[PDB]
Structure formats: structure tokens, C-alpha cells
Amino acid sequence: MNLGLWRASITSAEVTEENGEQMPCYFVRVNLQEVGGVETKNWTVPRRLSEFQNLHRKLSECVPSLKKVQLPSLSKLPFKSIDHKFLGKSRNQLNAFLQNLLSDERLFQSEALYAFLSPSLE
Ligand SMILES: [Cl-]
Known part of the structure; x- marks a missing residue:
């Protein structure tokens, strides 16, 4: 795996229902053109604010300086x-958070970052 060749950008946001409450949902456009070879290279994956917060917490184990963010x-x-x-x-x-993670060589093999940037098929 090398997430340092993955490019990601949030192209839009909207509100959805997670459990009972209004949950921001962000559309993450992911591009692996920098990866060579023959594979799927483009998709958009929606992630909820709560999934960004979960990701932050998991990555914060591997790299404890991320607890400051x-x-x-x-x-x-009310x-x-x-x-x-x-x-x-x-x-x-x-x-900005995604750009900072993807520029951080410590995370280029992060299973959590990989699963977060990967397609979500409910
Ligand atoms: Cl409120």
C-alpha cells in the first residue's frame, strides 16, 4: 500500500440522519492516477463528521501528535x-486535515486511512 500516491478532496457537504440527529456528510473525491498499473483509480466516498472524528482518534494512536489537532x-x-x-x-x-494526513509519510500504510478513503457500498 502507499497512500502517499492517493489524492483526496472534499467536493461537497450536506446533512443526513445518523441515529436521531442531523449529521454533516462530506463527499471525498479520491484519485489514484499517481499509482501506476491497472486498477480502479477514481471514486467519491461520502463520510460523516463522526467518521472523520473516529479516524482522527484511531490515527492518534499510531501518531500521538495528532491528538493536538x-x-x-x-x-x-440549544x-x-x-x-x-x-x-x-x-x-x-x-x-485541510485530509491534505495534512496524506502529506504525512508515517500514515502511508495506515489501514484506517485506507479504509476511510476507500469506496463505501452500504
Ligand atoms: Cl442544535
């Missing part, structure tokens, strides 16, 4: 519903 968070306060400003900023933050 703050990801977007849903406000527990009247803090998800709006377009939060989706837009959370998307840019999560996108």
Missing part, C-alpha cells in the same frame, strides 16, 4: 442547528 464539532447548546456557514467552514477544515 482540533476537528469541527457539533455544538450541544439553537445550534447545522447551517451553511458551519458546513462551509467544517468542509475547509476537514479538507
Whole structure:
């Protein structure tokens, strides 16, 4: 495996239902053109904010400096519903997060990063 040849970018975000609550969902476009050979090289995988937070926690085991990184968070306060400003900023933050992970040689064999960037067939 070499995730350092994988390119990923969040192309859009929307809200979905995870359990009972409104959950931001981010569409991650993944490109393996830099990988040679004959295989599937392009897809989009939707991931929920909660799946980014899970990924952060797992990768934080392998590389404990990642514990310092703050990801977007849903406000527990009353009247803090998800709006377009939060989706837009959370998307840019999560996108920057993906760029930073994929530039980090320590993760180029991360099974968790691989499973997160891989296709999701519900
Ligand atoms: Cl709320």
C-alpha cells in the first residue's frame, strides 16, 4: 500500500440522519492516477463528521501528535442547528486535515486511512 500516491478532496457537504440527529456528510473525491498499473483509480466516498472524528482518534494512536489537532464539532447548546456557514467552514477544515494526513509519510500504510478513503457500498 502507499497512500502517499492517493489524492483526496472534499467536493461537497450536506446533512443526513445518523441515529436521531442531523449529521454533516462530506463527499471525498479520491484519485489514484499517481499509482501506476491497472486498477480502479477514481471514486467519491461520502463520510460523516463522526467518521472523520473516529479516524482522527484511531490515527492518534499510531501518531500521538495528532491528538493536538482540533476537528469541527457539533455544538450541544440549544439553537445550534447545522447551517451553511458551519458546513462551509467544517468542509475547509476537514479538507485541510485530509491534505495534512496524506502529506504525512508515517500514515502511508495506515489501514484506517485506507479504509476511510476507500469506496463505501452500504
Ligand atoms: Cl442544535
